[PDB]
Amino acid sequence: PLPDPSQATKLTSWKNELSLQALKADLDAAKPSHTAMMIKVK
Amino acid sequence: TFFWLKKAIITARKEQYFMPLASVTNM
């Protein structure tokens, strides 16, 4: 068993869809500022 | 004299394939 995660499948009928990697790249780009900010809150 | 970054490097958990296969019976 064990179906493979990240097996590509088109969820919607939009001409251009996001896909997971774009969102994760945005998150990894935005993270360093958030990590720097959280030190002051701590 | 040296700035100390907080978020420490952490490793993940090794993937395991044999355990999901096994079924469990209560004793």
Partner: protein
Amino acid sequence: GDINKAMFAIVSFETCKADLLKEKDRYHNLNKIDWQSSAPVNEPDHATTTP
């Protein structure tokens, strides 16, 4: 410096399978998920009070 000008916003929350099944049509592609791996122990970035 303005919340409205932000392009994106990302939030991480704890949820269970029953919450996802409350609205079955809303969510797709549920079978492939490995429930056991995605736990608060395995995610170190999420900040929570659950033991």
